[PDB]
Amino acid sequence: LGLERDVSRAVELLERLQRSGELPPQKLQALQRVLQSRFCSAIREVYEQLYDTLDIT
Amino acid sequence: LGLERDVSRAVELLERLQRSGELPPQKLQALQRVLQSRFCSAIREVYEQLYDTLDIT
Amino acid sequence: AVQRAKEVLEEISCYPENNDAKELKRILTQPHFMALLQTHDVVAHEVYSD
Amino acid sequence: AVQRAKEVLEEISCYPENNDAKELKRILTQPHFMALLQTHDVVAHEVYSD
């Protein structure tokens, strides 16, 4: 689902820009916590888990 | 959250009616498979895991 | 998943004799169980719709 | 979660100098990442939003 690749890429991309400090990083750091948060982790596991679930049943 | 108690109760409640066999057991069997299915299990784990996440974050 | 549950409520609703149908209509209608079901459709749809 | 993400796209979108912003906008725009985020709001909303 390219979720780990897209999220992880969005997380580092937000940090990347955060390091640059060209635009308001406050919103970028907010996202970091929105995706990095343990919550989105469980949810993310769902997407990957669900796909597998499809292959099982 | 009460999803385990409500789902598990809906599962046995669907079986319960199935035991009696008075109403269309087809749609009821469908539900049982929708709540018992491994998929809904992952999703269910999310609701529980999510609540915990709240307590963490 | 929510629609299927809903449909069941209608069937079991028409049955005022099955006590299981009663407790099932209540729980099945409980928004909470609906929320989880919502997740069921969101994913199940994006994976088996288009 | 989605709104916050979208908000960032707008900010980074206003900057045609950051190459990460471009690739970041794309990733944050695809409905896939939005779907997961959708789950974020669905639960959080049904958790304690009201």
Side-chain angles (χ1 to χ4, degrees):
Chain A
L1 305 92
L3 252 156
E4 180 159 338
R5 187 146 141 76
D6 289 340
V7 176
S8 191
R9 183 171 169 169
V11 177
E12 246 277 289
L13 274 173
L14 286 155
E15 296 233 338
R16 218 168 166 209
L17 276 129
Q18 237 136 119
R19 286 134 138 178
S20 268
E22 316 249 43
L23 20 69
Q26 271 83 102
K27 287 98 107 203
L28 318 174
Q29 33 231 223
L31 264 52
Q32 289 286 105
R33 307 249 108 278
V34 179
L35 332 179
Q36 300 247 224
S37 39
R38 206 138 237 74
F39 183 113
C40 217
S41 96
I43 318 295
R44 249 216 271 160
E45 309 239 73
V46 190
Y47 276 77
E48 273 170 40
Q49 274 222 120
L50 293 177
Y51 262 43
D52 270 51
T53 333
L54 331 185
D55 262 325
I56 317 211
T57 154
Chain B
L1 303 92
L3 253 158
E4 180 171 307
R5 181 202 58 179
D6 277 340
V7 176
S8 190
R9 183 168 181 175
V11 184
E12 183 139 318
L13 273 174
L14 287 151
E15 296 164 18
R16 222 165 169 208
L17 304 152
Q18 239 84 242
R19 290 190 165 199
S20 304
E22 314 209 74
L23 2 79
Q26 304 287 299
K27 297 211 293 213
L28 317 160
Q29 245 137 110
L31 262 46
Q32 194 199 18
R33 296 205 158 162
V34 178
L35 339 187
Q36 291 232 232
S37 36
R38 261 260 96 173
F39 179 112
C40 203
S41 242
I43 318 302
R44 249 214 287 155
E45 309 239 58
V46 190
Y47 271 73
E48 271 182 90
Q49 276 236 126
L50 285 185
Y51 260 40
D52 225 278
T53 339
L54 329 178
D55 217 317
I56 322 210
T57 94
Chain C
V2 176
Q3 175 265 278
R4 289 230 178 200
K6 235 166 188 232
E7 231 75 283
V8 173
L9 329 181
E10 245 278 58
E11 238 54 275
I12 59 134
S13 276
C14 217
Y15 289 55
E17 45 135 19
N18 293 260
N19 300 110
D20 323 326
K22 311 275 120 206
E23 313 159 292
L24 202 40
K25 222 261 163 145
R26 293 179 177 189
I27 307 150
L28 283 185
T29 52
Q30 249 137 222
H32 288 114
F33 204 170
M34 316 202 119
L36 171 74
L37 288 168
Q38 218 151 352
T39 356
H40 208 245
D41 311 338
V42 101
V43 180
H45 180 92
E46 245 265 62
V47 198
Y48 285 91
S49 177
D50 268 307
Chain D
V2 172
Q3 176 265 277
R4 289 237 138 164
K6 293 204 146 284
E7 240 256 20
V8 173
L9 324 179
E10 231 238 280
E11 177 200 304
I12 58 134
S13 167
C14 271
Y15 296 58
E17 41 169 50
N18 298 265
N19 188 255
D20 318 332
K22 256 121 253 296
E23 55 190 349
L24 186 37
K25 214 210 70 170
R26 299 257 100 194
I27 305 148
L28 277 183
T29 33
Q30 46 226 34
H32 309 353
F33 206 168
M34 319 202 120
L36 174 74
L37 291 169
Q38 241 138 329
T39 357
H40 215 243
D41 310 316
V42 95
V43 178
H45 186 66
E46 234 53 59
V47 169
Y48 41 35
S49 160
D50 274 273

